[PDB]
Ligand binder design. Sequence first.
Ligand SMILES: *[C@@H]1O[C@H](CO)[C@@H](O)[C@H](O)[C@H]1NC(C)=O
Ligand SMILES: *[C@@H]1O[C@H](CO)[C@@H](O)[C@H](O)[C@H]1NC(C)=O
Ligand SMILES: *[C@@H]1O[C@H](CO)[C@@H](O)[C@H](O)[C@H]1NC(C)=O
Ligand SMILES: *[C@@H]1O[C@H](CO)[C@@H](O)[C@H](O)[C@H]1NC(C)=O
Lengths: 439, 439
Amino acid sequence: YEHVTVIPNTVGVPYKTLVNRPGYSPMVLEMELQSVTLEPTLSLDYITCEYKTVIPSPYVKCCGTAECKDKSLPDYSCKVFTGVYPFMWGGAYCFCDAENTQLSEAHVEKSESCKTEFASAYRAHTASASAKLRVLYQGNNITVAAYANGDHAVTVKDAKFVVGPMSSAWTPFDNKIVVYKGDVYNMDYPPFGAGRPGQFGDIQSRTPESKDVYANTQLVLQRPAAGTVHVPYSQAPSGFKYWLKERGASLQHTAPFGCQIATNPVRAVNCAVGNIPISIDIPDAAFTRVVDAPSVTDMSCEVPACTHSSDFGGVAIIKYTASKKGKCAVHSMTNAVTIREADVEVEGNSQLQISFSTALASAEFRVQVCSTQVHCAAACHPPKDHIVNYPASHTTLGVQDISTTAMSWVQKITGGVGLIVAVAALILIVVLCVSFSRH
Amino acid sequence: YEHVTVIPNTVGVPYKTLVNRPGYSPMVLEMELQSVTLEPTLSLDYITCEYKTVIPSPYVKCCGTAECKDKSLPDYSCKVFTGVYPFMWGGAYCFCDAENTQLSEAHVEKSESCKTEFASAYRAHTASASAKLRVLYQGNNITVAAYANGDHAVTVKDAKFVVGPMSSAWTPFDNKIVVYKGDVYNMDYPPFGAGRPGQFGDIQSRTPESKDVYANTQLVLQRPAAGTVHVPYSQAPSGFKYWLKERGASLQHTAPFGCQIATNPVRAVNCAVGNIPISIDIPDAAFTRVVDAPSVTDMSCEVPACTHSSDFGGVAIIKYTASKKGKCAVHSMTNAVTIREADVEVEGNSQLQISFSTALASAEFRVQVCSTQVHCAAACHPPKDHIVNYPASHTTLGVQDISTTAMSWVQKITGGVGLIVAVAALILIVVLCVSFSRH
Ligand SMILES: *[C@@H]1O[C@H](CO)[C@@H](O)[C@H](O)[C@H]1NC(C)=O
Ligand SMILES: *[C@@H]1O[C@H](CO)[C@@H](O)[C@H](O)[C@H]1NC(C)=O
Ligand SMILES: *[C@@H]1O[C@H](CO)[C@@H](O)[C@H](O)[C@H]1NC(C)=O
Ligand SMILES: *[C@@H]1O[C@H](CO)[C@@H](O)[C@H](O)[C@H]1NC(C)=O
């Protein structure tokens, strides 16, 4: 037997559904959603880290001319200076006091620490979805897990379950994301091979194990100070450290709809969007014939209390006469009132007690117990507590939900006004006809 | 200095573009596209292979009653038969002649061969693209390779190249594909856990190394024959072998646009759709000043032959006087005529020879040689060969492209008819004016 239902995407709230098959007693199922997860598909682009500067010992040539050649190393620079006269701790180094030169050079390499301290950029694509459910079936709790689409099915206790697809494709991730030790940021990083001297992306490589490194820092050699041997230079500071000090709030704290974020692997969970259809296949052996179930012949209802708070603040007592001992199901016949208890045991001549919640200021509803129905009514009072720590268990109201006292006042005024118009209209009709016929 | 061009997505055809910078001599570049590759993103769903049936020795209990219990193994079946009287080579087995029973059972397992002979299903997502180019630059051939989007650049001989994005998103793959040893098919395979007894997907698993196996075959035990010991059964044949004998043609033979396919990894090659923009950055050192290049003062043109075939069927001779020896670039000033030669050498007083192709029945064009212009004209004859083995090297013609003889005939006929109308109008006007004034 095929049954189809729809459940809204709310975590931590039970829902009930009624199964009705001709010739058999009705059955009621209860379901609760525990978790929903989305998972995107990623592709790596490049990584960044710190740089190192390498400077060899200088070469000083006095009373001769020095020169140097070009090299293929990254950010290579070479310059020759004239007029030097270096000193050491023991006196002047060379005999010649004029026509001296000095040669200096430097280049840039990748830091050893990049194996541990680094950041990576990813390109994002369409995400998948999965869900986990609890089902109350034949008085026992069972669990299922499945992908949230139509291409998967599971079987538990000879019942088949299919879930999905989801009604919405909203995703909290952009096309370009950056991940660093548990944080995810939305950032439009610069193209590969087009970096900047003082921002994110000054050093680029494809993978931590590669040898090919790109750099776009500035490096200029300067004239040495008189009497000292050293190699001064000017260079722009590393951009990676600058980012760490100003990167700001992470995606976890700013995302809408209450989503939570994880990074290993990247995930987003419990996003409160849309609804999820469900389909169940129930085997024939689960049903009991109407000739075997007990019958109930007489009912009455009273309601001693009602407060329309967010919780189960209502109680009702129903009297019954049963023909024999057995089990019976209970279900509400309205949408504005929910009943907590799923079933009862009936015997002889006695009474049963149930609890309910509702938002109505004046409540009227019907309750069905083993194929018969009873009418209940009561008035409800407001609560006193301004703020609570949990969501409500009931649906919202519409324009039709009005107190019976207010409805009476509306009818009286509208009727009265209509009567004045109706009488005046009749007078005009009579006068016109008399004039017509007299002429 | 930036230069932006567009080249159509056709493999094996050269194209030329003109770079013109005030103060410097013009430069001509030539480019050719060698290959384009598309690569989709895949995820694995399930695999299929062959099945095995396991049957242990039967147990026979004569003049006693056998029984058996249920087990959790896939497709487990158990039955008891009465009234057996087995024989063996040496005589009847048991002393009792009546009240004998036999117990039989079987179950289904996964074949050992599944490690080598199997098929896999994938879900497809948005593909990436890459390209390989040849460039003629500074008189030498260089090559580049890049991703076909705006997020990548390369540097060769101090020139920067950016290629892409593509103008079209057409992809030859569907959402669901199946791959088997080099063949790719589009197939809507059944969902997991919902197979059929005689079709593709009767046995399913998640990965070749899994222990969890699903099967939906039929297996029924039958009564044994009199006087023998055996275990007959009825079972549906394997669906996997049926597919292999009936799978039909693969995408490589049926796909549109002439696309080629490879499977390791899955790729589509040389699909002829759309066009590709390109941007180049040329350094200043490559340019030569107009004061240093030679000048040409006198030009003439003679064209001894032209046949407008698909190949280069035209020849022209140009006369020149040059101020000094040097290099010179040539370029066509029209769209309907393409010139094969990119550069010439000029010295003294001499002549040069060029070749061209066009579809025009009557050709007229200008040629630029070192910043001067020469005018050429000719009539062309048709070819005699019906079919060739290569695409044309020239553009198509429009409605305005008409031979000079036909144009003269059209003008004469239209002019004559128009003159007759003009005269008749004048006569009518004068007569009407006379009547107006006289009345
Ligand atoms: C731990 O160290 C390994 C290398 O030894 C590195 O790959 C990894 O990112 C480190 N993890 C953390 C949390 O620092
Ligand atoms: C298990 O079922 C019982 C009813 O017999 C119910 O009270 C309980 O909440 C269920 N367990 C969970 C975790 O919901
Ligand atoms: C070769 O055999 C291995 C297993 O031994 C299998 O995984 C692979 O697909 C085979 N390749 C071909 C081309 O048959
Ligand atoms: C390579 O350059 C030469 C000129 O030096 C040219 O003739 C040749 O056609 C080029 N190669 C290709 C494949 O076009």
